[PDB]
Amino acid sequence: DIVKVAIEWPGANAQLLEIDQKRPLASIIKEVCDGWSLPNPEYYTLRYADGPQLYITEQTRSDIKNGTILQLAISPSRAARQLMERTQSSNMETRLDAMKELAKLSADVTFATEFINMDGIIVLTRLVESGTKLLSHYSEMLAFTLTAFLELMDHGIVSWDMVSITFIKQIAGYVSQPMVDVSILQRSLAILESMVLNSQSLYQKIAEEITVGQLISHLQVSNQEIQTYAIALINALFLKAPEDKRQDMANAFAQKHLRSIILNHVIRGNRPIKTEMAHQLYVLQVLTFNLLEERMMTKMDPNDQAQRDIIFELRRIAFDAESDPSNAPGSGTEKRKAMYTKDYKMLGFTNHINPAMDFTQTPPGMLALDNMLYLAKVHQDTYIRIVLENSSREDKHECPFGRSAIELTKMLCEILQVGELPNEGRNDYHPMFFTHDRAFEELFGICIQLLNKTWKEMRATAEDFNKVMQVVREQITRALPSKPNSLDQFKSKLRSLSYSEILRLRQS
């Protein structure tokens, strides 16, 4: 086809051309240079005048729409060679302006490919590792160099394995040290993040050079952009951590108050939360919820006494206090088992005899058991009341704790999207999970109370089990878009969202 464009040249009138797409670029350029009386048309290449001003090749020339504004520019190969030479100049103002142009052009893959194939990567890292540090614009010069280096690496042409490890150690040292120039920190964080996300070997080297506290300390500053690349680097470490070692890493960051620091410095910060930051919060929240996946898909081993002891503990907390008689021995082994079995019926388990079988269902697996124990140990008052008010299965209107807690845990996993890998587009996150160290377990506690309130508000029976759960799912889902900044606020909206309320709201 034929596309009409205009091509510009500094200090001269633009040329209006009808581009024949069947015609070679070299021929077109030759004619253009003839119009402006320019020698050596082989020196030049077409380039967009506006926007990113990308170089144009024979493969990308299809995207040139009608009315596009182009510029006759120095060819990417010739420019790459000129700039690399100017970076080895005796004049330093020469090198600052050269490096500044490198920081701009390195984003263009057409230019980057040329510069990289001129041993460009090692040219830059060697400027960083042994440049002259005594001069007026050292930090400025370093910043542009790091910018150009990163943009070159982000084209997926050069493996991080080829990058000098002393260079990487130096960059990591900029992050671990008490304070560095703010722009140097940003470049360093961005580099380390990209290295982690795009390799395996180098990932192990970061945990050596930089401690958890040091990486978290970059969240305690006013600069929102710093905070953003700080969490980006943290999210990268979590994301590409081996399943083997993710839980320990989450513990290490938690024991140094990663959550509360983000809560106070970002969510409760002075300046508004920007789009880039909101995305990293989404990513972080997705990654933390994914920690539950292992336990969610972990089937209980009924033959493991250590796992059965957890259920024994649940039964013990519920039914065995000092107000109760002593099941002293003399009571047959068949008689003691009879009492245990009834307890498991009163606890609402399906398999009354061996309740461990209830947790072979994955999802929610052992995660449901962890939630029950958490409720029993942290909120005994709540656990006790729930199981005692719903003890007799003979009563048709009572709610089985076991069957409910298992289903609820499954339900909460679906709503929170546990076992999902974060995309690049989402910015949505639930703020209240940043307000407590065990937010998921607290959520279960609140929702199991909700479940019981909703159950008795519907005057439900065992036959209506699935119907109640459907209501509870809707109650929780409706309270979320209001985006509560605390678990108490979330609990408050649940109070208003009673069964009588939700029924009214689909009449609409």
Numbering used by the authors: 6 to 513
Authors' account:
In the present study, we perform a detailed biochemical characterization of the BAI1/ELMO2 interaction, and find that an evolutionarily conserved fragment located in the intracellular region of BAI1 specifically binds to the RBD-ARR-ELMO (RAE) tandem of ELMO2. To elucidate the assembly of BAI1/ELMO2 complex, we solve the crystal structures of the RAE tandem of ELMO2 and its complex with BAI1 at 2.5-Å and 1.7-Å resolutions, respectively. The RBD, ARR and ELMO domains of ELMO2 bind tightly and form a structural and functional supramodule, creating a highly conserved elongated concave groove capable of specifically binding to the BAI1 fragment. Each member consists of the Ras-binding domain (RBD), the armadillo repeats domain (ARR), the engulfment and motility (ELMO) domain, the pleckstrin homology (PH) domain and the C-terminal proline rich region (PRR).
Diffraction-quality crystals of ELMO-RAE belong to the C2221 space group. In the structure, the ELMO2-RAE forms an elongated superhelical architecture that consists of three domains: the N-terminal RBD domain (aa 1-80), the ARR domain (aa 81-301), and the ELMO domain (aa 306-513). The RBD domain adopts a typical ubiquitin-like superfold, which closely resembles the RBD of FHOD1, consistent with the previous bioinformatic analyses. The ARR domain contains five armadillo repeats (ARMs), though the ARM-1 is not complete. The ELMO domain has an all α-helical topology, composed of 11 α-helices. A Dali26 search suggests that the ELMO domain represent a novel fold with a global architecture. Notably, a 16-residue flexible loop (421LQVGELPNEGRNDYHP436) between α6 and α7 of the ELMO domain interacts tightly with the ARR domain (see below for the detail). In the RBD-ARR binding interface, Y60RBD inserted into the hydrophobic pocket formed by Pro81, Ala84, Leu88, Leu110, and Phe116 from ARR domain, which is similar to RBD-ARR interface occurred in FHOD1. The ARR-ELMO binding interface could be separated into two parts: (1) a 16-residue flexible loop between α6 and α7 of ELMO domain forms extensive hydrogen bonds with the residues from α14 of ARR domain, such as H284ARR-R431ELMO and N295ARR-E425ELMO interactions. (2) the distal side of ARR domain binds tightly to ELMO domain via extensive hydrophobic interactions. The second interface is further reinforced by additional polar interactions like R264ARR-D442 ELMO and R300ARR-D375ELMO pairs. It is worth noting that most of the residues involved in the binding interfaces are conserved among the ELMO family proteins, suggesting that the supramodular folding of RAE tandem is a common feature for all ELMOs.
